[PDB]
Design a binder for this molecule. Sequence first.
Ligand SMILES: *C/C=C(C)/C=C/C=C(C)/C=C/C1=C(C)CCCC1(C)C
Length: 137
Amino acid sequence: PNFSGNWKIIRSENFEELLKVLGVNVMLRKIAVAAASKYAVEIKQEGDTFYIKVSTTVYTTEINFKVGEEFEEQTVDGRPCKSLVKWESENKMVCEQKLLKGEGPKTSWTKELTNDGELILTMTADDVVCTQVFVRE
Ligand SMILES: *C/C=C(C)/C=C/C=C(C)/C=C/C1=C(C)CCCC1(C)C
């Protein structure tokens, strides 16, 4: 597959519920949900190496990794973690995360390229799964 692209969000479900599990208070959850309404994901993929830039209106972050090699990023609620991405199939990868310090919910994410040109991101905290769908810009 080629995940490369400038991806624009078209749907976001269960994001507030995810943030609630992660301990974010109500007003900030609503504000974060609003920022997700228009956010972008830019992917450059070369073989098993990924460069990912996630951007909202006022914030941008980069996530760089090679599949199967541990790296450091942050959880959704911003806690530093160690991460490891593996393929689950031709067009889907899964990332397991472990907190660098302390305890907290078990978090992870997945990225899938569908056959109709959508990118599906999921983000999980314990029992709660957020699903977001993007198309290429
Ligand atoms: C592989 C693609 C990944 C890991 C995308 C991750 C995206 C996020 C962690 C998005 C986080 C956001 C917040 C934590 C609040 C502001 C809105 C978002 C959706 C940009």
